[PDB]
Design a protein around this ligand. Structure first.
Ligand SMILES: CCCCCCCCCCCCCCCCCC(=O)OC[C@H](COP(=O)(O)OCCN)OC(=O)CCCCCCCCCCCCCCCCC
Ligand SMILES: CCCCCCCCCCCCCCCCCC(=O)OC[C@H](COP(=O)(O)OCCN)OC(=O)CCCCCCCCCCCCCCCCC
Ligand SMILES: CCCCCCCCCCCCCCCCCC(=O)OC[C@H](COP(=O)(O)OCCN)OC(=O)CCCCCCCCCCCCCCCCC
Ligand SMILES: CCCCCCCCCCCCCCCCCC(=O)OC[C@H](COP(=O)(O)OCCN)OC(=O)CCCCCCCCCCCCCCCCC
Ligand SMILES: CCCCCCCCCCCCCCCCCC(=O)OC[C@H](COP(=O)(O)OCCN)OC(=O)CCCCCCCCCCCCCCCCC
Ligand SMILES: [Cl-]
Lengths: 55, 485, 100, 505
């Protein structure tokens, strides 16, 4: 049962999640500039909204 | 204030670089001469570095309502001048293969350097606005200098449009801050607000819109999607400047703003800055984990390094080591970045079209360019923050400032981000000593100008190692360079 | 007398309209046109603020803003020319080779 | 003081090894041997001039020698070094294993062998610094610096049979496990420095000053856990062990990195020198969790070793099982268990070294480490099979081999404090016998399971015989006369044990 060091495989989850997250984040890196501009628009709304709810 | 003879001495760096821009332009007018025009540019930039001595002897002083010359200004002026002289030494070998106007490259590097010196002495919103544009508009042409290359044109169009959008958010934010303040000086931003009234909705909204502009220039999430594309498309000589001069110059003025502005100690802005830092630290490393292009990898890396620096800004109103941390960190980031990007420049020179940006190109660098592989290793270890490198001393400062300021979520992010980072940095480092039998590598140029670039990346690596084991010399200099509070 | 708030809202409307224009249009020309609306709106806000405080600083900032708009439009339209000369296409979606 | 030179000579010799390859690819090895020989001689001189046997516990801190030189005055960080019976014994072991690490990689005379020896010498220089550093930052710096040379030795000079990809994968896993864990310790060192300033007003990184820092139960626990995470990865303590088997498997086949950077107990010393003294109350309340983690490692390591096929990975897991006994002992507060931990830390180093060196020699003849392709090697070799049996008899803890003295002393002391844990732990001696005999039967006994194992193999050389026989004599002497070693570490271990118990009360 333990032949393949199960506890080592459990400690490899932090790295499987990392790789997966990296690929998901890189999906926003589409070369489309209009998306890049929209990204800054979304960021502005979020920053201003937070500043008003944390004022 | 007016311009007294004494005030004029404190302006030596700005005046010398400005005169260089004129004399070099009049030289191009007389006759295009790549060697002379490049030499004149380097001589002027060096003269400005030497003039810093006279500025220091004169002492701290506010030249006009727009500029304050102090130790902080001298330190960041030195950093921008060093990163700009290096850009010129790396451009000559590359521009030698550029069969078109090449003297204008140096003319633009000089005007961009003028922007950084202004940003170093900036004590007013007008100076902040003008300095960013003086370091951005020249870079639009530098990022698209090889317009004939598809990637360079794409990079230039992306940077110009996004930087223009960022400049409008910045201006609109500054206008809203002015509507509430009535004064455009940093010390007056939040001064009119009474006790417990600092969080004035419009003042916070103005800063928020200004952060969109500043965050873009500092490649901070969620305004970072441009970094990998522009860093890759821009000619290698230019990428070095965009990764060093612009970031250091703009991060410094932000530090002075949040230090002098009373509103700087707002919890709402601090909590918002904290979310940006956490995201930047984690997202940057996670996106660089699978990169096979060194330029894009170094782009995502910048996102995380700037996130680490933001932690010191968030801990600014809680300790004094915050300013010292940023100085030491930025000095290390400069040498580490000049080393990595400079090696890429030398491996992409002379200009023959596309730059050597694939990691496959570096898969046996040691067996062809031994010293270049060694430098890249040292820089990869420095950017990873490995003890024995200056990069670690910068990370130590950030962690110390964070712990003293009880920024536990942020200190935890620096540890997780650094752990994620080690995977890609080490991968690039060990790759240099692997054997790539395939040899499509171009032969190195054999002129003293190309060898000079090799000396720059070598000296930068030596500094990263000497100051990584003995950092007191640098700590002493940065400690002398303190803002005039 | 005009309420300072009314002047600032006018600028905000012109700023958000300019931004909407920059995101919904694929033509590089209409994107550059949208940016001019955004920077003009920011300059208008400075004039409104300077007028409320009775200071020349608002108009001084406007001059710096229009100077950037002149320089930015100059470089912007130059890149548009280069794109047209080589790709005979102003769809910015096509300028998206570098990604991931 | 000579303490500074126990770290400089290794570093200077490493530079010389690289700069002397120009005189031939057979020169670097002699420079490395002389370098490690001088460090070992200096260590033995310190042992013969410290009168450790006649030193009575005067209370922490109690150093036979100390050196201090300003390094980073702004932060109050200095090159502070100090020696003690515990540190002395660890430095002499590093010297002995360092000489053997040079001798084991002697037939390696390829190009860039100078850089190999440079990395090897610097790994040993860092290990010696970890045992001598009393400045918290110097300790951390040495802890983290020694990993960079190891990374390049496993990735570029690793197992000759493994592909570059497998070797790099292992080196990266080792570095990320270790550097990240070390960073969690810097966060705790920095927090302790600030808690001291706030409570007192002094800015110090000196262990002697930070020894009594007034702190709350919660902060003391969190600071203690930060150090433990770093000492759990290098011990290793399950579940932070995955990096060990991989690193051993992909490390230079000769066994140089195994002896120099993996067989020196820098984590056990750290738990005894800093965690127990700096955080006495937190260590006392974490004792139950720590001791049960050790019991798990004893059985988990034993079962994992039994199912390994690769002989080097089998030996790697035996280390996890053996180090579990040391963890239980460190958290008992008993002088008998502490003295036994010191003996086991030395004995395991010698017993594991022999197995690792013999494993490399075997590979040189059969070109395989898979036991499924061995068998009846007793009838095909002249020394290796018999000498491997000895080291396995010592590994199972046969009385008369030195591993028994340490293991049984730990149990005798642990029983007086935690009887139930000692009872379950002793059953680990039966599991050890299972994996120890399994390896000998699956490799040297029975019939050949492959053609390579069915032919007479080349015999062991005088160099190979000398290094292995030296380890045999040392283990037997430590088994029949362990007093000279116990008399040197008594004062240091006494100071630590008293501190912990008195501070908890
Ligand atoms: C002798 C004449 C002929 C030779 C000329 C000089 C040749 C070299 C020129 C290039 C370098 C110039 C650097 C000058 C640094 C010293 C400036 C100075 O005057 O230092 C003292 C100054 C305060 O002076 P003062 O106000 O008169 O003091 C009154 C006390 N009651 O305090 C300060 O202003 C602090 C200055 C230090 C901090 C800023 C440093 C800026 C320059 C370096 C930038 C890069 C930093 C990183 C470098 C890393 C190097 C490994
Ligand atoms: C991937 C790993 C990443 C690790 C990131 C950090 C993890 C630990 C986070 C701890 C969060 C704080 C917990 C305690 C509550 C807040 C702090 C507090 O109440 O005291 C802080 C302590 C004392 O100072 P203070 O009380 O602020 O000032 C008055 C002093 N009489 O002064 C202090 O600064 C001490 C704070 C507690 C100890 C912090 C250091 C922990 C080291 C790592 C432990 C990891 C395992 C757990
Ligand atoms: C407090 C917690 C308990 C105590 C912890 C003590 C320190 C533990 C440090 C390690 C944590 C677990 C790491 C698990 C993976 C170890 C190796 C690794 O990082 O990645 C290996 C993986 C192998 O794949 P590859 O290298 O591509 O080889 C070819 C394909 N097999 O390579 C990959 O493809 C993975 C790509 C990503 C690698 C980097 C990200 C993984 C780790 C993220 C941070 C985890 C938290 C660390 C926090 C600091 C320490 C507490
Ligand atoms: C792997 C090695 C590192 C193990 C890290 C986990 C240790 C957890 C210790 C714990 O939770 O102790 C809590 C308490 C003493 O700590 P205290 O400061 O009072 O409470 C706050 C603790 N963060 O004491 C208790 O209440 C202890 C009771 C047991 C709870 C923790 C059990 C952990 C079992 C798995 C360990 C792995
Ligand atoms: C995995 C492989 C198998 C593992 C099996 C583990 C079995 C564990 C058995 C634990 C028994 C503990 C017990 O009986 O209680 C503790 C007992 C007395 O404890 P103590 O503190 O000495 O009593 C007060 C006087 N000092 O402790 C003792 O002193 C008892 C010592 C003898 C224990 C014998 C265990 C086997 C009994 C059947 C044979
Ligand atoms: Cl070279």
């Amino acid at each position: 049962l333990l032949k393949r060091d199960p506890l080592n495989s459990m400690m490899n989850i932090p790295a499987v999640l990392s790789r997966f997250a990296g690929k998901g984040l890189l999906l926003s890196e589409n070369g489309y500039l209009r998306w890049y501009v929209a990204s800054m628009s979304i960021g502005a709304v979020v920053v201003l909204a937070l500043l008003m709810v944390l004022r | 204030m007016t311009i007294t003879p004494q005030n004029l001495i404190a302006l030596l760096p700005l005046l010398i670089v400005g005169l260089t821009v004129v004399v070099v332009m009049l030289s191009i007018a007389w006759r295009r001469n790549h060697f002379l025009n490049a030499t004149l540019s380097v001589i002027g930039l060096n003269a400005a570095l030497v003039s810093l001595w006279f500025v220091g002897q004169a002492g701290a002083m506010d030249v006009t309502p727009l500029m304050r010359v102090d130790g902080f200004a001298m330190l960041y002026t030195g950093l921008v001048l060093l990163a700009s002289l290096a850009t010129c030494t790396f451009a000559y070998p590359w521009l030698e293969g550029y069969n078109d106007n090449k003297d204008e490259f140096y003319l633009l590097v000089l005007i961009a350097a003028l922007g950084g010196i202004l940003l170093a002495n900036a004590n007013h919103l007008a100076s902040l606005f003008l300095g960013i544009e003086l370091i951005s508009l020249p870079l639009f042409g530098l990022v698209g200098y090889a317009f004939r290359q598809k990637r360079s044109l794409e990079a230039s169009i992306k940077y110009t449009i996004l930087s223009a959008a960022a400049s409008s958010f910045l201006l609109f934010g500054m206008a809203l801050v002015y509507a509430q303040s009535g004064d455009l000086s940093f010390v007056a931003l939040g001064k009119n607000l009474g006790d417990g009234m600092l969080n004035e909705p419009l003042l916070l909204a103005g800063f928020g819109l200004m952060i969109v502009g500043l965050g873009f220039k500092l490649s901070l999430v969620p305004f970072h999607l441009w970094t990998p594309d522009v860093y890759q498309g821009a000619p290698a000589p230019v990428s070095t400047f965009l990764a060093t001069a612009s970031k250091i110059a703009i991060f410094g003025v932000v530090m002075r703003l949040f230090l002098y502005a009373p509103v700087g100690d707002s919890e709402a802005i601090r909590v918002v800055l904290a979310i940006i830092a956490f995201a930047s630290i984690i997202f940057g490393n996670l996106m660089a984990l699978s990169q096979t292009n060194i330029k894009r990898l170094l782009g995502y890396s910048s996102i995380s390094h700037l996130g680490y620096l933001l932690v010191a800004l968030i801990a600014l109103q809680t300790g004094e080591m915050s300013m010292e941390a940023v100085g030491v960190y930025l000095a290390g980031y400069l040498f580490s970045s000049l080393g990595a990007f400079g090696v890429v420049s030398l491996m992409s020179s002379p200009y023959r079209g596309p730059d050597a940006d694939s990691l496959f190109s570096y898969r046996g660098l040691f067996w062809h360019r031994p010293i270049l592989a060694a430098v890249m290793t040292v820089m990869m270890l420095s950017l990873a923050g490995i003890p024995m490198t200056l990069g670690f001393i910068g990370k130590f400062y950030v962690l110390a400032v964070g712990v003293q300021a009880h920024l536990w979520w942020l200190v935890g992010a620096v540890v997780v981000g650094s752990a994620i980072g080690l995977y890609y940095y080490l991968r690039v480092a060990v790759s240099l000593y692997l054997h790539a039998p395939e040899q499509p590598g171009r032969d190195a140029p054999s002129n003293w100008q190309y060898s000079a670039g090799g000396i720059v990346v070598l000296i930068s690596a030596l500094l990263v190692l000497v100051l990584g084991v003995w950092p007191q010399p640098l700590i002493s200099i940065v400690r002398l360079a303190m803002p005039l509070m | 007398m005009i309420p300072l708030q009314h002047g600032l809202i006018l600028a905000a409307i012109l700023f958000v309209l300019g931004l909407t224009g920059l995101v919904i249009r694929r033509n590089l020309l209409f994107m550059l046109i949208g940016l001019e609306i955004m920077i003009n709106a920011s300059a208008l806000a400075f004039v409104v603020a300077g007028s409320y405080w009775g200071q020349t600083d608002g108009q001084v900032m406007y001059i710096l803003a229009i100077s950037l708009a002149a320089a930015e439009a100059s470089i912007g339209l130059a890149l548009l020319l280069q794109l047209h000369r080589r790709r005979q296409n102003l769809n910015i979606d096509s300028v998206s080779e570098m990604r991931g | 003081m000579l303490l500074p030179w126990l770290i400089l000579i290794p570093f200077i010799g490493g530079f010389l090894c690289w700069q002397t390859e120009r005189f031939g690819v057979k020169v670097p090895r002699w420079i490395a041997l002389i370098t490690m020989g001088l460090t070992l001689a200096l260590s033995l001189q310190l042992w013969l001039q410290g009168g450790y046997s006649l030193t009575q516990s005067a209370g922490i801190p109690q150093w036979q020698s100390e050196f201090d030189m300003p390094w980073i005055p702004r932060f109050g960080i200095s090159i502070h070094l100090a020696i003690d019976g515990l540190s002395l014994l660890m430095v002499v072991l590093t010297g002995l294993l360092g000489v053997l690490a040079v001798l084991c990689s002697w037939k390696e005379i390829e190009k860039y062998q100078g850089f190999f020896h440079l990395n090897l010498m610097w790994i040993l220089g860092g290990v010696i610094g970890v045992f001598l550093a009393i400045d918290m930052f110097l300790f951390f710096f040495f802890w983290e610096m020694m990993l960079v040379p190891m990374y390049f030795l496993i990735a570029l000079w690793g197992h000759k049979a493994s592909d570059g990809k497998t070797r790099i994968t292992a080196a990266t896993k080792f570095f990320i496990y270790t550097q990240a864990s070390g960073l969690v310790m810097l966060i705790a060192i920095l927090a302790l420095v600030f808690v001291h300033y706030n409570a007192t007003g002094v800015w110090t990184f000196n262990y002697e000053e930070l020894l009594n820092t007034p702190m709350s139960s919660g902060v003391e626990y969190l600071l203690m856990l930060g150090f433990f995470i770093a000492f759990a990865v290098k011990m290793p303590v399950v579940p932070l062990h995955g990096w060990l088997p991989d690193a051993h498997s992909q490390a230079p086949t000769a066994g140089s990195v195994d002896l120099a950077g993996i067989l020196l107990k820098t984590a056990a010393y750290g738990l005894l020198r800093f965690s127990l003294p700096l955080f006495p109350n937190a260590s006392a309340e974490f004792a139950p969790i720590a001791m049960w983690l050790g019991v798990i490692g004893i059985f988990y390591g034993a079962w994992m070793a039994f199912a390994q096929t690769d002989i080097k990975r089998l030996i790697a897991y035996t280390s996890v099982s053996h180090m579990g006994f040391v963890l239980i002992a460190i958290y008992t507060g008993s002088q008998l268990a502490y003295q036994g931990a010191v003996i086991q830390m030395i004995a395991h180093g010698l017993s594991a070294a022999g197995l690792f060196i013999l494993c490399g020699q075997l590979y040189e003849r059969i070109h395989t480490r898979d036991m499924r392709m061995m068998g009846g090697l007793w009838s095909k070799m002249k020394w290796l099979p018999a000498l491997s049996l000895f080291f396995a008899v010592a590994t199972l803890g046969m009385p008369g081999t030195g591993n028994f003295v340490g293991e049984f002393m730990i149990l005798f002391g642990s029983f007086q404090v935690v009887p139930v844990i000692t009872v379950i732990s002793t059953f680990g001696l039966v599991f050890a016998s299972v994996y120890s005999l399994a390896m000998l039967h699956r490799a040297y006994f029975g019939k050949a399971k492959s053609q390579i194992a069915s032919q007479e193999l080349p015999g062991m050389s005088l160099r190979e015989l000398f290094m292995i026989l030296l380890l045999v004599v040392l283990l037997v002497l430590l088994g029949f006369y362990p007093q000279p070693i116990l008399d040197t570490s008594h004062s240091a271990i006494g100071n630590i044990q008293q501190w912990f118990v008195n501070s908890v009360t």
